[PDB]
Amino acid sequence: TKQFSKVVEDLYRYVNAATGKPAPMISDDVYNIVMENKDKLNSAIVYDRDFQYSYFGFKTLERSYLLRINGQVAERPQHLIMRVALGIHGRDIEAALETYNLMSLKYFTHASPTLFNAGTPKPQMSSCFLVAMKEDSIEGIYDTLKECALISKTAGGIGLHIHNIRSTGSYIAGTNGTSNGLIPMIRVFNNTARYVDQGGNKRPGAFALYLEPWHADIFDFIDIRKNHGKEEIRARDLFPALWIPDLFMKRVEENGTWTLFSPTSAPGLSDCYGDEFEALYTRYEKEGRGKTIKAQKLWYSILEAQTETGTPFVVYKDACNRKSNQKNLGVIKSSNLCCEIVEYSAPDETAVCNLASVALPAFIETSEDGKTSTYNFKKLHEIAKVVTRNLNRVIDRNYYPVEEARKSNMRHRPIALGVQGLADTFMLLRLPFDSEEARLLNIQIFETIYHASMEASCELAQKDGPYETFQGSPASQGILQFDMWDQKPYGMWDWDTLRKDIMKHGVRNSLTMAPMPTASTSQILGYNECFEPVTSNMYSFQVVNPYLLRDLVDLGIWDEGMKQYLITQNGSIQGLPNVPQELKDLYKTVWEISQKTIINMAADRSVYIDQSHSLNLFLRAPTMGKLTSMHFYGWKKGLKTGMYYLRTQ
Amino acid sequence: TKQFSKVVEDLYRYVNAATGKPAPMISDDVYNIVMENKDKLNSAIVYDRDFQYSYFGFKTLERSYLLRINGQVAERPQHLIMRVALGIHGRDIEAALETYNLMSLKYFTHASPTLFNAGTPKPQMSSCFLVAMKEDSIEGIYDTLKECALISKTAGGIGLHIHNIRSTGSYIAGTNGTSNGLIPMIRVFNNTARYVDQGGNKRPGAFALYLEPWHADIFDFIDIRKNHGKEEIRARDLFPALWIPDLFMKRVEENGTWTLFSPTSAPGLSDCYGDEFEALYTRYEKEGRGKTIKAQKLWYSILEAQTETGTPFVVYKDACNRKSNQKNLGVIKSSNLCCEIVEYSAPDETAVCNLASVALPAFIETSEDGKTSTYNFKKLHEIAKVVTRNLNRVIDRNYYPVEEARKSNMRHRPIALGVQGLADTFMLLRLPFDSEEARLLNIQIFETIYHASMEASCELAQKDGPYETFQGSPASQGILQFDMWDQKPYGMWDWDTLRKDIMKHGVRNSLTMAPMPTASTSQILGYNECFEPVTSNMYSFQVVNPYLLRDLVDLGIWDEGMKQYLITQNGSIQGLPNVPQELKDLYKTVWEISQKTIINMAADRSVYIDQSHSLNLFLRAPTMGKLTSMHFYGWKKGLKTGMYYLRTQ
Ligand SMILES: Cc1cn([C@H]2C[C@H](O)[C@@H](COP(=O)(O)OP(=O)(O)OP(=O)(O)O)O2)c(=O)[nH]c1=O
Ligand SMILES: Cc1cn([C@H]2C[C@H](O)[C@@H](COP(=O)(O)OP(=O)(O)OP(=O)(O)O)O2)c(=O)[nH]c1=O
Numbered sequence A, B: 001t002k003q004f005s006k007v008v009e010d011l012y013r014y015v016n017a018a019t020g021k022p023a024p025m026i027s028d029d030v031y032n033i034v035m036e037n038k039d040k041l042n043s044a045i046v047y048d049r050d051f052q053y054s055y056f057g058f059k060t061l062e063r064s065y066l067l068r069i070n071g072q073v074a075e076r077p078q079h080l081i082m083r084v085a086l087g088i089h090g091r092d093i094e095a096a097l098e099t100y101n102l103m104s105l106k107y108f109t110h111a112s113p114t115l116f117n118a119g120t121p122k123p124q125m126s127s128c129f130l131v132a133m134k135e136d137s138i139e140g141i142y143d144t145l146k147e148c149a150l151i152s153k154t155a156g157g158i159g160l161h162i163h164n165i166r167s168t169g170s171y172i173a174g175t176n177g178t179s180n181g182l183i184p185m186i187r188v189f190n191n192t193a194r195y196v197d198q199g200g201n202k203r204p205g206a207f208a209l210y211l212e213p214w215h216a217d218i219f220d221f222i223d224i225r226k227n228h229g230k231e232e233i234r235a236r237d238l239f240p241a242l243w244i245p246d247l248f249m250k251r252v253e254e255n256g257t258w259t260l261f262s263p264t265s266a267p268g269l270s271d272c273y274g275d276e277f278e279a280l281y282t283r284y285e286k287e288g289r290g291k292t293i294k295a296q297k298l299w300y301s302i303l304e305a306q307t308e309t310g311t312p313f314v315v316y317k318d319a320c321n322r323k324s325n326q327k328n329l330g331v332i333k334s335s336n337l338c339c340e341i342v343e344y345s346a347p348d349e350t351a352v353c354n355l356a357s358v359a360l361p362a363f364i365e366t367s368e369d370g371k372t373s374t375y376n377f378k379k380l381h382e383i384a385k386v387v388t389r390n391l392n393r394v395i396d397r398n399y400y401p402v403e404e405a406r407k408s409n410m411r412h413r414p415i416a417l418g419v420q421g422l423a424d425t426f427m428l429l430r431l432p433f434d435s436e437e438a439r440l441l442n443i444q445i446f447e448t449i450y451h452a453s454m455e456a457s458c459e460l461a462q463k464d465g466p467y468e469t470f471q472g473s474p475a476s477q478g479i480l481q482f483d484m485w486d487q488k489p490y491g492m493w494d495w496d497t498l499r500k501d502i503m504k505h506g507v508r509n510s511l512t513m514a515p516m517p518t519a520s521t522s523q524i525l526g527y528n529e530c531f532e533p534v535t536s537n538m539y540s541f542q543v544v545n546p547y548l549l550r551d552l553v554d555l556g557i558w559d560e561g562m563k564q565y566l567i568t569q570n571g572s573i574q575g576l577p578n579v580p581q582e583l584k585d586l587y588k589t590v591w592e593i594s595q596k597t598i599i600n601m602a603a604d605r606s607v608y609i610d611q612s613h614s615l616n617l618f619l620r621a622p623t624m625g626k627l628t629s630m631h632f633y634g635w636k637k638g639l640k641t642g643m644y645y646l647r648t649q
């Protein structure tokens, strides 16, 4: 079917034939809206815009995104986009059309759960949940398990922190028995992640687990992904993530000692950070409450697990807490599944985020005369304020799987904007990733996205009031993200006036920035993942980097001896017979870029990031000394997410 | 320590040294009682009675029963017995001493959880829980999981019925996904049984699962114990039990069809029985709601699973429901872990039982002159009324792990008396198990235990009122167990007067009889398990049946050629060179007794059994035809528990 209202009509009237059950795929209010504005909405749609998707991006859309009736596809990409626009915007037709246009022209896109569920009856548009283990008891464990199950019924990944659970051998009152510890309890959770598929479909598993490196069960925990296992000791479908206090990095650097506690013989450690933590830790240590070991014995094991599995993830507890606008809430005990979100959670508050990404290439414009291109920072600023408003709408229109998630979200209203196609943007603008021009561009991009999102949230706070927990926040006092890094902003945008308005009117959102992986939403738009360099100049069907391809032909030098060398060399063009140094410098693979520049750039953009970002590390010829220096480099650079995956060859 | 109050004192003042935590092992009221009656209670104890336990029975007591302080034993058997007596009886010192005496002289014993926890702070003295799957939803599954976890924190086995859970492929509303079915949900439960050890001690695993043979997931379910598995398809630590409607046995016998439904496409089947079930089933069948198959295809698979694993257990739904005094409550959906308990359960009611067993040998008395022995039915009657009162006390003094278990138990007050050492009783009295004299003795024993327990409960109903749900019950109408089998009682006891009193005054207990396996409590007292024949005349340390041993020597014929033949022949004396036919007939192994006599005897005693009993079947040279005839034999004999385990050689 062409006509959109006709498509909506089918979707809405759909009935499951195998069961005789009316199975509507559109909500009542979004049906009524479409029908009450059929002519406007149908004639707004430009189907020519369906041809903006590459063969692969469209096949990503077809396989898992466009709504289906009886297994056959029912939605054209333009129909999905308008459905999302209405689901987000409802009655505000003006904004719906604005978002339809911006999205269909590929200026930005919303995270997968949004694309799946916006305008449908069960509108669960959130990607992230961070859950607190409720209590160190069988009941608390099982209330928490139930909660993960209920959340796993819907789209979205889970970060779960377990710092409060009794380690192996700890005592259980009213029985000569002792605790089994973390591993056997992790196994239960792993099994629940395997069971709750949403049925029998394909994105299954995936809980990230958060632990501080002092927990006595740590050596087994970091190893939960080891493939050569002792079998029952592992958790195949779960991800270990380390919640590292500075003290640990210090002890490792000093080649000193590290002490392992059960939370029960050393209470309160995860409910403080910084100097208060170091004082409590050091006191417990001297009081003989734990099992002292050599710091570097744990370190060696961490690196060994990382080298082999790519995990555990590394997120610095102290950086996260010290530099968070949610610090008036209490101590943040975890990140999330992909290490971008940094939000407070408690037994009654399960932190949620809704994400979107701005497509960075869309703002490159030659508009001057011929050839020479610039970057439209003004349009970016403009779009980022649109994306900001959309994500607030989503907050209010979202259906929450559990009450801890609704209570959390309505209270603090956190939002997460990110990017895709940074590599595309550098490549188009003739900038090497490690160039000074790339370094500058990365700072200014993140500056304007942050400023925009903050300005738009301040405007929303004027219309609607600040978020419930604004007062007492570092924003209420004028302390914006970069301030908490003790830096002046780059200064492309007027921060004094914005800060002046925040202090006066509030912001609508406790948080706004968390550049995410964009793993599937980068494929729809056809750009490179988030903020990371190209991994290979040969996609695989087998595709060669389009900006590379173009360049080779313009030089004549593209034959077959060129096509074969690329498949040989893993899409690297370094040390290749007849290629200019300019291309070599431009089309470096991530394996060919100084992991130090990656971390520098990460640290530069990080002053404009409210939350954190999913920072993969790529080591070509990996060693323990090499990896050690990347961890400590990022740690001293003040990073929140020292490391997402360790990807290796 | 000798002195009991001194032993109590230590137990009560105990402190966990590893943690500095006061870890009392006696309750406050039982401490105060002991101290307030020290002289009476200490001088009541006869330590000479500790020598009534065989080497093996005492080592059973030492290993897991007598309370420990720092791993060292702290309790003499006489101390445990008095602790149980007080835990059960509290302030009623008279009854405490009565029970101490009867128990220490080995007239009866209480079930393991009682021996473990009576008089201790967390007094969980129940052995059995039957749990209802709460709802066909992720929430209901997980509320139920939590509940099993909480119950598995304490002693006792669980029967769980799952008839209401959507089979594989069934539809899930608000998602193109479909159900995973029973197997993946069973796997979750299996994993929770493995986790909740009570810590790190030794009786772990064990949930029995109840399903009607019409559930579409049945072929995989019956196979959950198969050792040669497809791995993830199994549930190693759980037990399948079949809840079989008569219709199924009919269809199998008629070589007809059997139809498999999801509970969602055929609702209400587990919430009826008998003719109402057959009408609803047959209607669903004709309406095309299920997947028709040949009855005998399911049958063949059942027998194949049973032959290999010993499971599933077989309990007849219709026999259980038709012949239950709890039938005014609603339709009973399961038995329990060992197939003795038949009690109603609902999402808000989790059926509980407290068990004890009467030691059948203790009532044999020569008292006449010389040699000739009789059986004291009058003393048995007397003791069984004591055991009855004790188990009511336990109801009121028990600590319930979950509120569904307390609500259930306080309402209907079910009790479960059983026996051990029936084989000992036959062997002592010179009766072959398959003799007419054994057959008679089995009937009269079960008659007097039933009558006693009923009389004592009627007396309690006069003191305390009938149980909440007495009115409307078959007991309130004069329908006692045997009446529901359309039989006159054997007539050793005056049933008219008892029935007359019940009708007038009520009974305290909805149910009273459920002969259980006695697996460990038969070893303490040193008798053969429950009501089953000796399996071998050679225990194994290696011990030969004591009544056999004695007989051989009295005949001279006991050398070493005799000792070696017994270890050869698996403790069988059939076809053995120089042994009288009288001994052969007396010391038949269970493998040498007509499984038909077993079932006859089972069916005779079953008219005096309120609930059911744990009826193992023993097939020497097993075939599908042989097994088939035992199942149908027991089914037509009207048995509730057609089969507990299939034990084989
Ligand atoms: C019962 C049980 C608990 N545990 C763990 C889970 C919890 O983290 C921890 C204690 O939980 P719980 O024992 O359920 O909580 P509790 O009320 O008994 O607390 P306490 O005994 O200390 O007063 O023990 C096991 O590992 N295995 C078990 O069998
Ligand atoms: C969500 C989910 C449910 N199930 C099973 C568990 C339940 O038995 C059954 C439905 O449970 P639920 O879907 O949790 O209950 P519901 O509110 O969605 O009920 P319905 O959709 O039919 O209105 O599906 C799975 O096997 N896998 C899954 O991923």
Ligand SMILES: Nc1nc2c(ncn2[C@@H]2O[C@H](COP(=O)(O)OP(=O)(O)O)[C@@H](O)[C@H]2O)c(=O)[nH]1
Pocket: A110, A111, A112, A113, A127, A128, A129, A155, A156, A157, A158, A203, A205, A206, A336, A337, A338, A339, A340, A341, A355, A516, A517, A518, A519, A520, A521, A522
């Ligand atoms: N459950 C689940 N959630 C995921 C997965 N990948 C990403 N997410 C969630 O979505 C967020 C970012 O997703 P991203 O990789 O950018 O992909 P996108 O949401 O499809 O655009 C993370 O913070 C996760 O919580 C997954 O494989 N499983």
Ligand SMILES: Nc1nc2c(ncn2[C@@H]2O[C@H](COP(=O)(O)OP(=O)(O)O)[C@@H](O)[C@H]2O)c(=O)[nH]1
Pocket: B110, B111, B112, B113, B127, B128, B129, B155, B156, B157, B158, B203, B205, B206, B336, B337, B338, B339, B340, B341, B355, B516, B517, B518, B519, B520, B521, B522
């Ligand atoms: N959890 C658990 N419960 C059991 C086990 N064996 C028996 N039970 C429970 O106790 C009841 C009868 O136990 P029985 O075998 O006679 O042994 P006893 O309770 O130790 O005397 C059953 O109905 C079960 O619910 C076991 O191995 N594990």
Ligand SMILES: [Mg+2]
Pocket: A136, A137, A138
């Ligand atoms: Mg507790």
Ligand SMILES: [Mg+2]
Pocket: B136, B137, B138
């Ligand atoms: Mg439901």
